[PDB]
Amino acid sequence: GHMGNAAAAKKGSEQESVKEFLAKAKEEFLKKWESPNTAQLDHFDRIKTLGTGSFGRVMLVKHKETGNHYAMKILDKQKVVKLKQIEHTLNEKRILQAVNFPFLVKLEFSFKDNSNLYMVMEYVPGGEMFSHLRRIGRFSEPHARFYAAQIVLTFEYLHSLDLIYRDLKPENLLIDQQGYIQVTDFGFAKRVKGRTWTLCGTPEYLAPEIILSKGYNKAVDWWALGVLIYEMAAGYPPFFADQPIQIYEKIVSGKVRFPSHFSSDLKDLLRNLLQVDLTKRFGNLKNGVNDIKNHKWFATTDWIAIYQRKVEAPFIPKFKGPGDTSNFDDYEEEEIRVSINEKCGKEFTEF
Amino acid sequence: TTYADFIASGRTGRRNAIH
Ligand SMILES: Nc1ncnc2ccccc12
């Protein structure tokens, strides 16, 4: 067979140990999910806006008493209500409080006032993967594999908790000081033991079955991994066009083209992740995540060493000290005004 | 080239989720 006795016994034991880890991880998650205003706004100096969404913004802050820097996500409650994202916001906070994994951002404080909701999480200083990818152009296959292996482990973890992530893309991946990935946004994540039906995600990363308005499962995350690996290694995604509707036609077509510089191992992995047919997509078969982790393209990956953050990163971002923001673009700075009247109090009672 | 086609799509910047 492909493995001799020694390799086969090593692999089997490794897979069993993953099961034991994930079982303990699930037990810890549920305890924290069952039993979760831990700061206030004048506890922080606001320094600079790090990113923006329709919700509000993410700002670098310094915790006054301790001097530590954090990223503070500020959500305008009235905007959240108008955007119909009440449940997303409460769910994101609930996930972030409960999960624990080396590539998932750590929430430190959360609180609210009359106008806004605040999520204070670890500051990830190395910038968006998106910027690094567009600047470098494309990542070498070893560089892409280092990142990909972190997403595989992160999805292995989230899926064992029955969480589908649903918004993988370089824009949602930050690089920390050691060159490792941090995931921070869980606004579309959902606990899905079986199937779910919501049309959500980003057009280039949508699995066909989402586009086709089907009931779908965690395999959409493995499709999105294929898109991500492709984009990291090519510098552009497998399916693009002027308008989303044309991107969708390409996604559902079953056809994908690869740059000539893609290795054969990479193309094979990608054809199995970017598989329209759910009965054949890697990550969705009887062998589970093992089809991905044991694929030839990952043969050089020491999965435990990645988890332990003992692999030397291929790229270490510029770090000029704490509170340095040079890896982030400049955003227009608004003002965090706090109304004298409580807004949307009932809707966000549990926050 | 395919890269040129990607540029021509205008979706080379940060992409929003659908809404
Ligand atoms: N945790 C974060 N660190 C740095 N920049 C960010 C930008 C957006 C969301 C979270 C963060």
Side-chain angles (χ1 to χ4, degrees), chain A residues 1-23 25-27 29-30 33 36 38-45 47 49-56 58-61 63-78 80-81 85-176 178-192 194-217 219-244 246-254 256 258-285 287-311 313-317 321-331 333 338-339 341-342 344-345 347-351, chain B residues 1-18:
Chain A
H2 289 281
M3 292 191 288
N5 290 134
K10 188 176 172 287
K11 180 64 73 165
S13 164
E14 280 164 350
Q15 299 182 170
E16 286 303 296
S17 294
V18 166
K19 289 184 183 161
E20 172 177 351
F21 165 82
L22 299 173
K26 192 185 181 65
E27 165 181 64
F29 171 80
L30 295 170
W33 184 278
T38 49
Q40 64 186 36
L41 188 58
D42 73 2
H43 286 170
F44 305 84
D45 286 313
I47 302 164
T49 291
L50 296 167
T52 41
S54 58
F55 55 82
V58 184
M59 299 190 63
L60 175 68
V61 301
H63 185 264
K64 293 184 198 181
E65 184 68 10
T66 65
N68 280 66
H69 283 89
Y70 297 98
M72 186 173 64
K73 185 176 181 185
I74 310 169
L75 298 95
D76 183 309
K77 271 183 285 174
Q78 294 176 315
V80 172
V81 171
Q85 286 184 330
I86 298 172
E87 295 290 341
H88 306 69
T89 297
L90 301 167
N91 187 62
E92 174 175 78
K93 179 216 181 195
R94 207 168 174 168
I95 293 168
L96 279 172
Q97 286 180 143
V99 300
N100 178 37
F101 201 69
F103 314 126
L104 300 178
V105 76
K106 277 152 179 70
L107 178 74
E108 300 279 334
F109 315 85
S110 79
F111 52 94
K112 66 201 178 185
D113 58 31
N114 281 345
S115 292
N116 304 310
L117 308 174
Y118 302 83
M119 279 183 278
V120 186
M121 67 204 82
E122 195 178 312
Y123 173 48
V124 188
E128 276 186 5
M129 191 201 276
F130 181 91
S131 303
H132 294 292
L133 178 56
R134 291 288 178 274
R135 183 189 68 258
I136 297 162
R138 71 200 189 212
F139 302 150
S140 72
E141 293 193 25
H143 188 173
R145 182 162 44 239
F146 172 81
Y147 293 147
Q150 294 172 63
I151 302 302
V152 171
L153 290 172
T154 299
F155 280 178
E156 180 164 53
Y157 169 82
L158 295 171
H159 294 177
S160 78
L161 306 183
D162 298 316
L163 291 169
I164 312 186
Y165 183 66
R166 298 196 295 187
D167 205 17
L168 185 71
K169 54 183 175 183
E171 291 94 318
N172 276 348
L173 306 179
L174 300 169
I175 309 296
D176 67 21
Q178 293 78 47
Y180 279 78
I181 279 170
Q182 289 276 290
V183 180
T184 73
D185 197 296
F186 288 84
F188 291 128
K190 186 185 177 178
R191 195 131 72 105
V192 186
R195 266 134 54 93
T196 194
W197 285 261
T198 302
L199 170 61
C200 65
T202 298
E204 278 86 345
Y205 282 76
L206 296 181
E209 61 267 29
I210 299 176
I211 289 164
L212 265 0
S213 297
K214 299 185 171 312
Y216 59 83
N217 69 2
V220 308
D221 275 348
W222 296 123
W223 172 285
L225 174 70
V227 182
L228 181 74
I229 295 177
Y230 186 115
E231 184 166 351
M232 289 195 296
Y236 47 82
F239 314 107
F240 57 81
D242 286 5
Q243 301 294 339
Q246 304 167 309
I247 301 172
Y248 302 151
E249 297 174 349
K250 302 190 186 183
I251 287 158
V252 304
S253 73
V256 59
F258 301 109
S260 64
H261 65 78
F262 277 22
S263 67
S264 284
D265 290 338
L266 178 55
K267 289 185 291 183
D268 184 87
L269 170 66
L270 289 178
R271 293 191 161 107
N272 283 289
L273 292 169
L274 300 177
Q275 173 61 260
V276 176
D277 181 351
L278 284 163
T279 71
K280 297 172 175 179
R281 189 184 304 155
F282 276 20
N284 203 41
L285 312 177
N287 202 35
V289 192
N290 301 325
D291 289 324
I292 301 164
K293 294 172 80 183
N294 299 345
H295 188 281
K296 284 186 155 186
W297 193 70
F298 284 115
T300 63
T301 299
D302 182 338
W303 291 101
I304 290 297
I306 290 289
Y307 168 80
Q308 288 179 351
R309 302 166 66 93
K310 292 194 177 181
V311 180
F315 168 71
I316 299 304
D324 179 43
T325 60
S326 65
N327 292 309
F328 289 93
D329 276 303
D330 304 325
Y331 295 85
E333 304 282 350
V338 174
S339 167
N341 292 311
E342 175 184 270
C344 313
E347 293 90 332
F348 298 102
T349 303
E350 83 170 39
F351 187 96
Chain B
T1 66
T2 306
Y3 175 63
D5 295 336
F6 173 57
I7 299 313
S9 80
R11 300 186 55 92
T12 60
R14 296 188 79 260
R15 293 156 293 200
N16 295 321
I18 62 186

